[PDB]
Ligand binder design. Structure first.
Ligand SMILES: [K+]
Length: 112
């Protein structure tokens, strides 16, 4: 389990959400090795899809924008809360579930 220690220590975390991550190439192997950097990463909607931006996965652009996969119920919870004054949707942790799906726990963060 890869954790964003900075987010937890410097921000107050409000609601959280879980999503899958669409990985490409060797990205999956790098994540298993724990070669990730959360610095400056955030999630934002673009053309009907939620994307995780600026997440670094050590060696394809190591910081390419990656599509997040949301189930309808989670999308419904999120819609309308992403763009709110002073809040940022940030990745809190990345892990793989039993079936091998890469997952990211997102949280609305407010300046602490
Ligand atoms: K800190």
């Amino acid at each position: 389990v890869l954790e964003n220690r900075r987010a937890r220590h410097d921000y107050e975390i409000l609601e959280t959400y879980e999503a899958g991550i669409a990985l490409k190439g060797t990205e999956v192997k790098s994540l298993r090795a724990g070669k990730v950097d959360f610095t400056g990463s955030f999630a934002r909607f673009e053309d009907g899809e939620l994307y995780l931006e600026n997440l670094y996965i050590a060696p394809v652009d190591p910081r390419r924008k990656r599509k997040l996969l949301l189930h309808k119920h989670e999308l419904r919870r999120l819609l309308g809360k992403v763009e709110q004054k002073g809040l940022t949707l940030v990745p809190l942790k990345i892990y793989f579930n039993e079936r091998g799906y890469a997952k990211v726990l997102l949280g609305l963060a407010r300046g602490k």
